[PDB]
Amino acid sequence: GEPGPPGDPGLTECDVMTYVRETCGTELYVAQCTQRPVDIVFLLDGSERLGEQNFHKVRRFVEEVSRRLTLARKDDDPLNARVALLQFGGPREQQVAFPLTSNLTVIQEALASARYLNSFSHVGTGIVQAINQVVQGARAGARRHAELSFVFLTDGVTGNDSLDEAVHSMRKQNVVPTVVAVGSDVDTDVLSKISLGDPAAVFREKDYDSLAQPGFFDRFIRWIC
Amino acid sequence: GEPGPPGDPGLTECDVMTYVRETCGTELYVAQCTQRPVDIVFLLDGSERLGEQNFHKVRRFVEEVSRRLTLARKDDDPLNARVALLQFGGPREQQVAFPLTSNLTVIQEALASARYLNSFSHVGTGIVQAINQVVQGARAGARRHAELSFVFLTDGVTGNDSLDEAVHSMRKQNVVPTVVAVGSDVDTDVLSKISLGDPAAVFREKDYDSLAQPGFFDRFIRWIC
Amino acid sequence: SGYKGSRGDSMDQCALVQSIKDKCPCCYGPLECPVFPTELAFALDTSEGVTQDRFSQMREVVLKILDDLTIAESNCPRGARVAVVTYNNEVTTEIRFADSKKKSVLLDKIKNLQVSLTSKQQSLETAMSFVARNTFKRVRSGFLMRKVAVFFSNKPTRATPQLREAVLKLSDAGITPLFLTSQEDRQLINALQINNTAVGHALVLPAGGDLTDFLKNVLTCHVCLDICNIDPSCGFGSWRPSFR
């Protein structure tokens, strides 16, 4: 075929602009995934504003994400990362799901029978129950320093009876928040509180179906690892 | 399958908008082609700024246009429209081309042997030569009132030694123009002069290749017919 | 899936204009014709035997009609656009829909318009077709656009299929012709109208004397007739508001 097109400029205009701004005076650079010891526990609110079809789409997204990430063999601080999910709700004041575990078949089986609450859910009670459950699991799984990152898959608009206390407890519990809001309708206060004073620790997706968009999936997997 | 979607609202916001603007206080409505007696003569200036490959593209465009429009059998004021084209230049102060005729085989042969001038076009001399030639042809073809429309395939940037006199001759010769400029670089003066004081008698094409865009081709055939 | 559902209802064409009219300040006070923006196409005739004085009379008639009407100088869809042509066995455009931009310049052009004495014999059907398929090749947009053509004749038209076909084409084109000629012809009225459906009347003009009567008739209930409030008995017939 024909010769390839000529190369781009050595230092484009934006390059020099960034240089000058840097000397005297967005996007954040994160080192790509390296299978570092990680432990992630999702959180999907049961509020009826989610949607049965949207619940199915979120199930698909979660299983795809679990497929993409490498899964550790076991515990006692090997390399690789684990995964957990729960679907707490308002009614019954409690709900449970599978604990952290890398055995993917358990994940598939639990997801298959996943029940969509379609009911109110106060985020504070959910998060405190989640942190209690994951603390219990971690204690059952030795020290495994690694980390503890929580991904909030929800708009977050819900009852805040004990939001602040749970946020404080999570803050003291060496956690790394991360939020993926869906839809234009979102309250900035809840996002800010969960983000722990970060402007770029939140992603936005116009529709729940976009969770299957390859671009957003790649960005999310890059951010988490 | 599933039922169709709901229909268009009653007097859509734009509908009432136009109604109110009309009551007290763009696009022009043209009756679709009805094969009324029309005589059309093209004009492709040989200015070196056209391009040999762009000349081939214009040849293809003219071929397509002459193919789509219906062609009359003969003269003496029958229905249907004819076609003509010429490629006048500046050097040698003249050029010749096939006259108005519906024998598409002659059009094919002329296009096949079509020579890209890569030369100049004192648009005034070219247009006066064209009007003389088409007047001679029309006289050879009886009255055939019909009409006489010219299509200008040129940016128009060129020497204007005798532009105004030829413009006046065109005015007196019951002519109707239609100009399709291509490229950002265009002079408003020449376009206005050849458009005969019209703001919507000019089409703008981003690039020569856009001449093959079905949308623009359909719009052009709709305007001319 | 099924195709798109049917277009819904509407508030009719006229009565909505009545409503918006009462409600838009200063637009129900001083009326100015045309009632709605419209195209007007004058077509003069130079057929042999046309007396120059009669040409002057028609020139005065057209000038008065223009002055009584405003124009749409800008691109705002409000006001009258004009197009003046001359016709014979052939046709020759003089001023088209685009050149005219100011009332004074249009009046000056029309007054200074060349008078072309000639001898070619009349053929009104050619002018009919010309206006049908050349002058109205492009017209300004507007949901309530009105289009009117005014013609001339120094001799009654013949009775042939070509003219009836031509007027059918005119009607199909949306025009609302108002012919003017010295004397009536029941055949002309019959050919113009169709199946008890009028296309456009054929008035009468004088060989000298008073003009304000018929001039008033045309200016009120023909050239700038409100599509909504048609006068009680201005012109015997049935009228035909809106497109045809």
Place this chain on the structure above:
Amino acid sequence: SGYKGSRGDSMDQCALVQSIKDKCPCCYGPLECPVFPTELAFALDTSEGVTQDRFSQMREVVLKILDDLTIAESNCPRGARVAVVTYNNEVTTEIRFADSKKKSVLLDKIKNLQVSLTSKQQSLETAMSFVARNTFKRVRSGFLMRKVAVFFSNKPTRATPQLREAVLKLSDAGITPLFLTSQEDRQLINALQINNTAVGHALVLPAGGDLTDFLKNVLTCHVCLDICNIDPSCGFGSWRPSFR
């Protein structure tokens, strides 16, 4: 067609800033560290036997280091970001890269930070890995982004392969660590340095007495060393421009 051409030449990272720096008014007058916006990560050790008075000493050291440095309160790529953590057999983040927004609030938080008296036995490798793969999990952008970590130890480190692997990972992460400990260990230097190419010095800290003698060195020479105008003979070794 063939693939895209190669990247073009560059004016070199070092002296383009030299040029722009002699060129951006008032930016070549008063100096304020850090020379370029950078991340600084303090990690504190609560290892068994860490004397509380010594903890106060390190607290004052960190407080002074913070005061000497400015902060990037806004999102403009200019100023210092901070991250303070405590490490033991396990680790516990105290303040991350996000919460810090003002100098006074940061100073108050660090001064009011709880002292976690404990008895767990130390293992510096866990803290190395934590900082390598958790603290720097995300950092601010910038073509000349600079990263630095400061640590502590109330006991000399062991001589094990895992330490070499951890320091290799740190180097791969772009960090430029500056450890601090009571007493030297040639084995520590050897593990840090790679084939005679240093990765980070291991300075010394006092059990009392004067401090500024080494505070000046650390501040002028490691934390906010100029990228290109390096001090002639500060610290035995070979220095490093940035990255590895």
Place this chain on the structure above:
Amino acid sequence: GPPGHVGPPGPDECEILDIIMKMCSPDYSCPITFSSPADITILLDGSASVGSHNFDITKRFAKRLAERFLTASRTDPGQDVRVAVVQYSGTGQQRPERAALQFLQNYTVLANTVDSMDFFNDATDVMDALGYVTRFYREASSNAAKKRLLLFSDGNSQGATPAAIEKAVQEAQRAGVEIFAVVVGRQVNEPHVRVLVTGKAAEYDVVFGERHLFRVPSYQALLRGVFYQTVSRKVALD
């Protein structure tokens, strides 16, 4: 498949009014006349599907609706113009007390109740809400008056099947009150809201359908413009 149902008819008087008033520079606002005595009780959503700020904007819109209806010059001093407000939530959650709220001419109790209700944080429940509304009408409203009603809905509620809502709306019709549906957003079970509007799923009358349904894209858009004027005027017209 079969073609879709006819789309909504054109702008009514009140939005053509504000569109003309926007630029054309004669009465304005959006006048109303209660031709015959009647009542209205705008029902407000309180399920989580709305949310805090959405619930608050709905409260504001309800307040505006009530004030506009009450201020509208009564067509007869010898008779009354009557409005009321109540909040519905999960089963058996409909403030105020049964005997508490009557038809009102003043604005004290109505305004305080409008600005004092609380979000409930429970799944949408339409059955008991509709039963409460219809029984309250049956017991309270005077026999002669021909009343009207409005409702926010999403067609979603636990333990909801089309036949049950068919029966409930049939009971409401037996009570003898026409109903109108106003909804916000598109995350709505279309068949259920269509049923609620019509009462006969098989025969969805186009005229009854389009007239009785108002659609809004977003909660914020509900308050913007003169939509409130249009809905109130449409409620007024018999």
Place this chain on the structure above:
Amino acid sequence: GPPGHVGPPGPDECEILDIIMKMCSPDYSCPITFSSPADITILLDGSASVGSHNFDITKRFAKRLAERFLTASRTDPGQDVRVAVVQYSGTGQQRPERAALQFLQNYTVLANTVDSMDFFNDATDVMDALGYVTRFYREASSNAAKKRLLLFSDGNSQGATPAAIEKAVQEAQRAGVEIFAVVVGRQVNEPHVRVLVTGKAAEYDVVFGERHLFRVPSYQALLRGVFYQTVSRKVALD
């Protein structure tokens, strides 16, 4: 296919000066120094491919170039700094006559000639133009001076082949003048322009091409910004 050649290097001093001055707010503008005496004769297009207005903006750019070069503080009063201007067109059209124009120092006469030249409306001929330039230098410029030249072109010319351009540029090189190419737009015969820039088609040097080529997308953008000063300073640097 094979990969494309290396792209243009990073921006030089002048435009980085401009960008720092744009927002960062010491001598500025774009100082030049003619280290050693030389000559420059900016060659301006005269074929229709440019046009009337585009030819006018080219004339303005030429006038500015002459002003900036002449005003540049001569590095030595003992020797001179030399500039000239000519317009080329179809075969045998290079104003002024061969014996008229010398190296000019006062700016007014050169400026008057620049503002008085008329568009030729003759085909794009580059053979005779290059011959004119090279023979004029051969006859005129003093032996010691090592000169420089600019040239506008599109690489398109009737009766032109790569061999002819190569031979002409070789003759110019034998005359002993290095050449630089500045072009506008992209309706350009890339091989011919590259050959003119280098003269060694097969062994084209990427560094030579990138150093000796200037690309401007639009005629209007040519005068805009600091492009003129950047190119003039590049001409200045050895």
